[PDB]
Amino acid sequence: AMELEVRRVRQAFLSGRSRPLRFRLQQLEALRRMVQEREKDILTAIAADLCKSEFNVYSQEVITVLGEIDFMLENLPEWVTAKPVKKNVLTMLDEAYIQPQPLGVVLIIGAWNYPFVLTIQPLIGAIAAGNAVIIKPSELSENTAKILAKLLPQYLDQDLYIVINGGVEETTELLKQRFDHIFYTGNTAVGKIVMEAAAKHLTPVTLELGGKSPCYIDKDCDLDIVCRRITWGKYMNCGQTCIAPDYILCEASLQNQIVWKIKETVKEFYGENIKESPDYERIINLRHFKRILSLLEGQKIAFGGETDEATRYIAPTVLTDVDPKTKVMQEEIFGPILPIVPVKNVDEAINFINEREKPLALYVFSHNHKLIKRMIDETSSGGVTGNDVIMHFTLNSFPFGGVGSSGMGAYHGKHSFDTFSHQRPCLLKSLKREGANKLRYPPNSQSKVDWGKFFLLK
Amino acid sequence: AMELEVRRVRQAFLSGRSRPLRFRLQQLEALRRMVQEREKDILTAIAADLCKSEFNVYSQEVITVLGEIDFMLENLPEWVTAKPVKKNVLTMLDEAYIQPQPLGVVLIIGAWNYPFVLTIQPLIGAIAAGNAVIIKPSELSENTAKILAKLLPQYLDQDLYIVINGGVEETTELLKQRFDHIFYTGNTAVGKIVMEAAAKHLTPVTLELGGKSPCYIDKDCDLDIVCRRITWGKYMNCGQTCIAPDYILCEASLQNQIVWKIKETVKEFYGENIKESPDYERIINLRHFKRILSLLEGQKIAFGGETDEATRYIAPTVLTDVDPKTKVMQEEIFGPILPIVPVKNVDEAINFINEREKPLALYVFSHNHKLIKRMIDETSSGGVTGNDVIMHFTLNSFPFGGVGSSGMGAYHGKHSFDTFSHQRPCLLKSLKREGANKLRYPPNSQSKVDWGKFFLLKRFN
């Protein structure tokens, strides 16, 4: 059964029909139409999966997807064309170029937290690169998974681009099939399983994984501004974001003012009665609810900490003076708890980050530019935003991806196109000038060797 | 044992010593110095492994290595700098750039056929990107394995860059350790193993594997030129090359003339008595020698076929009317046998290729540019040369690497630098304009959503 679906999509790719630019452009226009004409259905499904308002679904997911379609539609004609390269002395008079081509059949495995963006954004790039695509949406975002399976066949080529739904067992069977590329967003442990399955067939992979994104706060800066930006990025989607600031590092005496300003910001963003805010989401399921609750045990709560099992509500929360060995500092939080871990200065913060696995993101707040450069130069992370959170995600011109445990490979904009392409170098000579080749042919001689020293070296 | 070795290399990486540009430049100068001062030693080692002339070792291996060092010494100060990127409307007043950084400790597993190029060329790139590096040379090129272990610690930083020698079982232990990137050249089956080990630690890999690089000859061509070029690329190193033309696809009626022209070229390259030519190498060991001999059973030898176990000599050989199910057409030859598989036309050649695993190289000979461009667009391969063989390897501009079963990832010049770096995007904002961010902050509203559609998606109206 998984084998048949793969064969169907492979056959569609092997027909050649996704190779021409104009077909690819038509499929992206069709996707755009889908998102426009069926906006209400899409918003309703994602909203139900995360208990999120339709406003927030629109602004976070739909606007990102729509922007990525327009950017591909505008640049793809340039991206598919062959690019001349600089030649050398042996090849000055030949034609040399690098031409992109599709990989074949690409598998996208979706995550649950932004279940439309994390399936559709990669798809866009895979479509654009000429591939056939299978999407396997996360079972934890069930409404979205179903709406994908229902709408794609109504707009996109039914045999080149398909949706396969299921859970761990179905994914395991699908990972036995042969793909040309596998793209996975999720967590470290399942990343290894993906990579191990890819190994069986030497399939290249892109893995967008997680970790704990640190947020350093320097004393030389306006905490009113800092805390608003952090509160936004932390509590969006209930903290269920790879790019969210997972924890704060800062001098111990900042704690009070930080706590106070986040609390004031929480009140402006979510009102006095947070459970009534249409803007504040719920934890995805009961397993994650309980996981996040357990991180609270033993901790000093500066504020928040109210929970409600039946609606999976956990209130925005900040913890002070946190010991790095406790549970809340030993796994990715992926929820609405923000620990503050005191550090005496920037060297201590840099050392702290360096002893841990390389995060997807790093955030540094300071007016001091040298401090920011040291922090960047001495750490390693997927990406960095200085004086804000999240925003580095939004630039098309940046590769978005992890490094070490937060992943390998990257995408967005042209980086998506390249990730789902092979850049094939082509050197075209003519059947002329054969006399010259005598220099490279046997028999070798001191004179031929010296030819090489004089023309090929400095 | 390996555990301790890797920990030593890692601690040296963590010191920060390899981060400054100046330090990387010093190491590449030290490397060039090693190649210059100890050239004779280096040539002798490789010459003994492959029974190869010092002139050929020099022109194939040492030149390539020195050329790569000069390219890096010149371009690296530009490569390490932060690159500004195109911003968008929300970020136009900020600073945005991509900066390259080392991955950490890199493992290079070498192959035996060009044992200096295939260790040192990747090494140059990994040094240039600021990494610590462990090289594991192939056991099969024993003299070269030993000279690397002896020379490298006399010129390079002895903790950042080491050589570990050994075969399968030490490689297996070495692959249990944690690297930041693993670079492997060799065959498909060991590639799977390397990737499986890398999967344990989410280590990215570059795999330069092989396959049967096809060579299509159109009847509309100058066959004398075509045969000289193929002869050259096929019989260099005794055909023990990943990018060698593995087999020929052409119309049956060309076969006689191909055979005759290859034979006359072989006489010009290697003389009447090929066993005495200093330009013709030997098979690397007895195992490969016997593997290659088995490919001759059952075949019509149009030319060549002479063998000698004691010196591991197999003469340049051409087979005609080969049946593609026979053993010669079912594995990578990596030897001086050239099969010819007749195909009626270019469509049959394209189908033949497309039913097989994607090769590392594809070669097309024709006066007709349309047909060459057609064969390119309808097939896939790591790289392509039209009207010659091998030469695409030599442009620093080109990424060099496979696709599907011939590999993943690429290197050479700036592509090595990139393969052994993480390109890290940095967006640096000021604390100004905080009022403007209300657009993105809760509480959300119809007004904010409509302004997003108007301004951010540019719908007016």
Give the number of A-B residue pairs with CB atoms closer than 8 Å.
292
Cβ pair A371, A218 in contact under 8 A: yes
CA distance B416 to chain A (A): 15
State in Å, rounded, how far the first CA of chain B is from the last one: 70
**Is A266 labelled as part of a ligand binding site?**
no
CATH, domain range B1-210+407-461: 3.40.605.10
Residues of B in contact with A58 (CB under 8 A): 449, 452
CA dist., res. B155 & res. B69, Å (int): 15
Annotated binding-site residues of B for NAD(+) read 186-191
All residues at 6 or more sequence positions from A406 whose CB lies less than 8 Å from its CB, including other chains: A209, A210, A211, A242, A357, A358, A359, A360, A381, A382
Q: Where does residue B220 rank: exposed (0-12), middle (13-18), buried (19+ CB within 10 A)?
A: exposed
Q: Could you say which of A227, A238, A242, A250 is catalytic?
A: A242
∠ CA A53-A56-A58, rounded to 5°: 110
- Helical residues (DSSP H) of A219-285, grouped into ranges: 223-235, 255-270
The residue of B235, B422, B438, B457 whose CB has the most chain A CBs within 10 angstroms, and thus the best one to mutate to test that interface, is: B422
The residue of A10, A175, A395 whose CB has the most chain B CBs within 10 angstroms, and thus the best one to mutate to test that interface, is: A395
CATH architecture of A1-210+407-458: 3-Layer(aba) Sandwich (3.40)
Is A331 an annotated catalytic residue? no
Cβ pair A406, A359 in contact under 8 A: yes
CA dist., res. A313 & res. B220, Å (int): 75
CA distance A408 to chain B (A): 7
Cβ within 8 Å, pair B202-A404: yes
Helix (H) or strand (E) holding B62: none
Residues of B in contact with A403 (CB under 8 A): 103, 422, 424
Q: What is the DSSP letter of B432?
A: -
CA dist., res. A370 & res. A383, Å (int): 18
The label of the residue with tokens 């904002």 reads B429
The label of the residue with tokens 């046997």 reads A442
Annotated binding-site residues of B read 186-191
Cβ pair A186, A119 in contact under 8 A: no
Q: How many CA atoms lie within 13 A of A209 on its CB side?
A: 26
Peptide bond into A443 cis (omega under 30): yes
Beta strands (DSSP E) in B70-220 are 83-84, 95-102, 105-109, 132-136, 161-163, 181-185, 205-208, 214-217
Cβ pair B424, B101 in contact under 8 A: yes
Would residue A96 be called left, alpha or beta, if left means φ above 0 and alpha means ψ between -120 and 50 degrees? beta
The top-level CATH class assigned to A211-406 is alpha beta
CA dist., res. A368 & res. A363, Å (int): 14
Q: Where does residue A271 rank: exposed (0-12), middle (13-18), buried (19+ CB within 10 A)?
A: middle
Q: Is the dihedral of CA B317, B321, B327, B330 positive or negative?
A: positive
Cβ pair B62, B42 in contact under 8 A: yes
- What resolution in angstroms does the PDB record give? 2.1
Tokens read off for A48: 């139900």
User: Considering only alpha carbons, which residue of chain B is nearest residue A67?
Assistant: B457
CA dist., res. B346 & res. A242, Å (int): 50
Cβ pair A134, A107 in contact under 8 A: yes
Instruction: Count other Cβ atoms within 10 Å, centred on residue A302.
Output: 20
Q: Would you list the domain boundaries of chain B?
A: 1-210+407-461, 211-406
CA dist., res. A256 & res. B444, Å (int): 29
Strand pairing of A181-185 and A105-109?
parallel
CA dist., res. A391 & res. B96, Å (int): 11
The label of the residue with tokens 């050479």 reads B412
Cβ within 8 Å, pair A448-B228: no
Q: What is the DSSP string of B304-369?
A: ---EETTTTEE--EEE-S--TTSGGGTS---SSEEEEEE-SSHHHHHHHHHTSPPPSEEEEE-S-H
CA dist., res. B11 & res. B4, Å (int): 11
Q: Could you say which of B215, B221, B242, B250 is catalytic?
A: B242
CA dist., res. A231 & res. A263, Å (int): 9
